Symmetry: C6
Subunit: 65 residues, 6 copies
């Protein structure tokens, strides 16, 4: 199996979002970036990037990679 | 039906704007970004992005997506 | 008629500039952005964008749109 | 005549630089922007843009326009 | 030999990451930049760039250069 | 002669770096910019730009120009 996306998280705080992701993916390495950030094309299975808005709310669906 | 745009909101504060949108779209997930931000081409029906100016006023017509 | 540009405003503070614009265009929706900001190609007659410098002075001629 | 460039100003503070420019161009409208800022292609004879570094020192030769 | 990449570091703090790198590469010159930063194409053997997220966690695999 | 590059400076503080450069080039006009900054293609012999990281350390080899 595998849970790789957290659509239910758009709009929630980073605090709330961490808590859920860690529940579902105990080994996740959570990265917090501002929306519009260009990342390196490297794929990492244990990583979860959160793309946040000005108030630190999840602005896009979190996904593994 | 559907209310998907809030033209009447250009120039108003984020506080004022939240209040109106939530009135019209109780399930809206409000995202606040600075004008000029490049977003991901993903369409979400419950989402409302607010594009704000330096003083946090709505700079463009808010819309669903 | 119509007053759509405030060339006399380059260099003045946002506070001073607001005051003048509102005098001439009582219905103006004043938006304050940093110089170099890319805006959405939408035209709004009641809107006045102020493009400011590091000290919040008007850096370019204010115009309707 | 006309004094349109202040090469002698690279490295000096904005405070120092203002003082000199105003000496030479009493009608100058001084604009302070960070180096790397893209401006609008509009030419203004009374305007002097200062392009500053992280410490607010003049990083490039000030010029009219 | 040579240790040139620290994959085990994604997600860790800059403080933690410094400590490990210096352990493995005592002569490393540690540089801390935000993710999405465009660097100069110059290669330096003693240098280790850390690409950090909003909370200062390592967002990409640290490497020499 | 001429000393135009300070390779020995990568990783050092701006404070430390100033001190060295001024030692070697007493007439240097020191400019401090963040890495990734696009500068104007103008060449100045008395100028030394320092490209700094998030902690204000020299991230690239300082050079005249």
């Amino acid at each position: 199996n595998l849970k790789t996306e957290w659509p239910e998280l758009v709009g929630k705080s980073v605090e709330e979002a961490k808590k859920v992701i860690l529940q579902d993916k105990p080994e996740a390495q959570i990265i917090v970036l501002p929306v519009g950030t260009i990342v390196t094309m490297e794929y990492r299975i244990d990583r979860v990037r959160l793309f946040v808005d000005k108030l630190d709310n999840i602005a896009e669906v979190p996904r593994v990679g």
